[PDB]
Ligand code: HEM
């Protein structure tokens with residue numbers, strides 16, 4: 001059927017689109033091009049032809065099949081952040097990825113998913129008893145920081161459990177995410193002029209070194225153990241795999257790093273948007289509070305509760321649909337294939353614009369926030385907040401458990417208020433690697449007034 005998109009200008013076509021991605025940010029540029037040209041179109045990042053697609057049918061084909069189980073990005077950028085053929089997130093070596101993923105899949109389901117519900121609640125409780133760490137003179141809570149701090153504490157106590165400087169690591173993680181987002185699609189030219197990136201190089205060293213201290217301690221505790229099998233975790237599994245010849249030390253270290261940053265990166269921003277939505281939708285917030293009374297009372301949250309929290313589940317789904325954070329997914333074609341009548345050569349980059357997809361396709365009221373969008377069972381071939389298939393979000397199930405547990409134990413205790421007019425729509429956003437608040441602006445704080 002041939003491929004819609006801007007003209008190749010004897011080598012200038014590519015330069016404009018790349019430059020546009022650099023100026024605009026990956027997210028907004030994807031939205032720009034899907035709006036101007038079709039919902040399935042072609043662009044260039046560096047040399048490579050890269051398709052940006054919002055069509056749900058294309059989405060489904062791509063995530064369903066093994067020959068798309070890869071992402072893309074600057075080799076120089078990925079090596080720089082330590083994700084070139086090393087973690088899982090942007091590990092683009094198919095075999096190395098294939099054998100690393102199982103470790104993440106195991107730690108993020110089964111017994112660990114069950115522990116996580118209570119670990120989360122206890123972590124948030126402990127931090128809500130310490131609001132003095134995060135509250136203003138005028139009573140303003142820095143929710144973003146609060147959330148990141150518990151999200152890290154959660155991840156640590158589950159996957160690594162080694163005592164750490166919470167506040168410091170949180171800042172370093174933000175530093176890391178920046179470098180990652182900055183360098184991911186910079187052209188090779190950029191990496192020549194060195195005073196243009198050593199800024200980021202230092203953020204990566206900051207976190208990596210901080211995590212080595214932690215892994216080093218974890219190695220010692222493991223080497224002298226009252227028999228291991230009585231307390232396995234994600235970090236130990238990796239280290240034992242490395243003592244068999246299955247894993248590389250560097251690779252082990254990147255995995256632990258990726259496991260620690262994941263929730264602080266995505267969950268906190270997600271829950272923040274969720275909290276602002278609750279503040280602005282009193283009717284929805286009452287439904288949730290009533291559901292909590294009916295299902296939980298004043299008991300501690302337990303695993304058997306989470307299925308029963310139907311209203312909240314819908315809230316989480318709608319929040320994510322309406323105000324996403326991870327609104328785009330990056331892939332690469334590993335074999336040739338024809339998809340929706342379009343020829344897709346192997347080596348072709350893909351960006352699935354799931355945020356735009358969720359506004360064009362299935363839902364009754366796409367462009368407004370309502371639980372009405374989830375009054376009837378949503379097919380999942382029209383709603384992919386996490387992705388599905390051989391490379392879908394590794395933490396897709398545990399994420400819903402964590403989001404429920406923290407939302408429950410927060411709202412259970414506090415009413416949340418927004419400052420001035422502020423709502424998710426009025427928040428100034430950066431739309432690049434993910435969709436998140438521009439933190440150089442202000443009025444991002446909240447007021448946590450008690451209940452009863
Ligand atoms: C609301 C929070 C989250 C959202 C919206 C989210 C969404 C996503 C999406 C859309 C992907 C891409 C899937 C694909 O390529 O088809 C992804 C990948 C991934 N996510 Fe999540 N995720 C969340 C939370 C988490 C958590 C809590 C963890 C673990 C602690 C996690 C770990 C990962 C990993 C390791 C990958 C890379 C998978 C791979 O390439 O093999 N995510 N996430």
Ligand SMILES: C[C@]12CCC(=O)C=C1CC[C@@H]1[C@@H]2CC[C@]2(C)C(=O)CC[C@@H]12
Nearest residue numbers: 089261262265266326328329330433434
């Ligand atoms: C969910 C995620 C991993 C855990 C983490 O630490 C932070 C993020 C945000 C960026 C996500 C990424 C997963 C892969 C994604 C979906 C892409 O293919 C483009 C954007 C990117």
